[PDB]
Amino acid sequence: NSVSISGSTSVGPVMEAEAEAFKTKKPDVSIEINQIGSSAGIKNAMEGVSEIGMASRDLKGEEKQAGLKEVEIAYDGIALITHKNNPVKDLTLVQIKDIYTGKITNWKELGGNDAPIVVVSREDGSGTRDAFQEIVGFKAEELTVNSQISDGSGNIKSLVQGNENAIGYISFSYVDDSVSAVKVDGVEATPENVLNKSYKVSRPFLAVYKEENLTESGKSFIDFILSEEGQDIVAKEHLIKVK
């Protein structure tokens, strides 16, 4: 019948592409997808507000308590994006930590322009923010007080597009010619390099649900996403197919 899904903004676009193709496979099934961030999607799945929650990170310890079933539908790299005109094309993971904690505050320190770094972070509740902080190696408390907060993947892309001195983080699936992803420790931000583990900033895309709430229609949609046709859609969105 009608399958309610809510959660990650990183997963939103591939989920919409999956729903569009699934409408030709099971025409009597309707899927409603709402993008509200990973933490809210997981909470909605836990409470039965959504039949399926979308997360762009592993579940936190406190969320593991709920006993949600977890299904990996893809893997995704997190790119460090700058304005397309920034001469800096390379950052080390150590430099990324120093920028985000406010130890490095001007692009001149990174060999770029004599200009301040406009640090952009996602809102609290973002799966991308939680995975990024964990891998880069700093706590929320250590984030520079000068950081801009952008609500959702779309807004962090828009802020970086419009500010020559900005830096932000986003799913590879949102990267296009309007922004530039830096190489991290000499490694290009590609699905190949996420899969061979040389590009360290990455995370799963998960569909989470309570076994008692998942309908035959919801189960059919997850199975479609994991099928060869479902995984071809995942690759077309610059994601990594489930290994």
Closest distance to Cl ion from the beta carbon of 62 (Å): 9
Are 93 and 102 spatial neighbours (Cβ–Cβ below 8 Å)?
no
Comparison of 100 and 199: residue with beta carbon closer to Cl ion: 100
Per CB under 5 A, the segment of 131-139, 149-157, 188-196, 216-224 that binds Cl ion is 149-157
CA distance from start to end of the chain: 31
Q: Map the footprint of Cl ion across residues 37-76, applying CB under 5 A.
A: 65
Per CB under 5 A, the segment of 73-81, 83-91, 117-125, 153-161 that binds Cl ion is 117-125
Are 222 and 55 spatial neighbours (Cβ–Cβ below 8 Å)?
no
Instruction: Out of 123, 164, 185, 229, point to the residue binding Cl ion (CB under 5 A).
Output: 123
Cα Rg of the chain, angstroms:
18
Closest distance to Cl ion from the beta carbon of 73 (Å): 24
Q: Which two tokens stand for residue 164?
A: 């020559």
Question: To 5 degrees, how large is the angle CA 84–CA 87–CA 93?
Answer: 90
Instruction: Out of 72, 90, 109, 124, point to the residue binding Cl ion (CB under 5 A).
Output: 124
Per CB under 5 A, the segment of 98-106, 143-151, 207-215, 221-229 that binds Cl ion is 143-151
Comparison of 135 and 149: residue with beta carbon closer to Cl ion: 149
Question: What is d(CA 77, CA 84) in angstroms, rounded to the nearest whole number?
Answer: 19
151 touches Cl ion by CB under 5 A? no
| In the block, residue with structure tokens 């907060």 | 149
Q: Which two tokens stand for residue 139?
A: 């706590």
Closest distance to Cl ion from the beta carbon of 124 (Å): 4
Question: What is d(CA 242, CA 187) in angstroms, rounded to the nearest whole number?
Answer: 22
Binding footprint of Cl ion on the chain (CB under 5 A) = 65, 123-124, 149
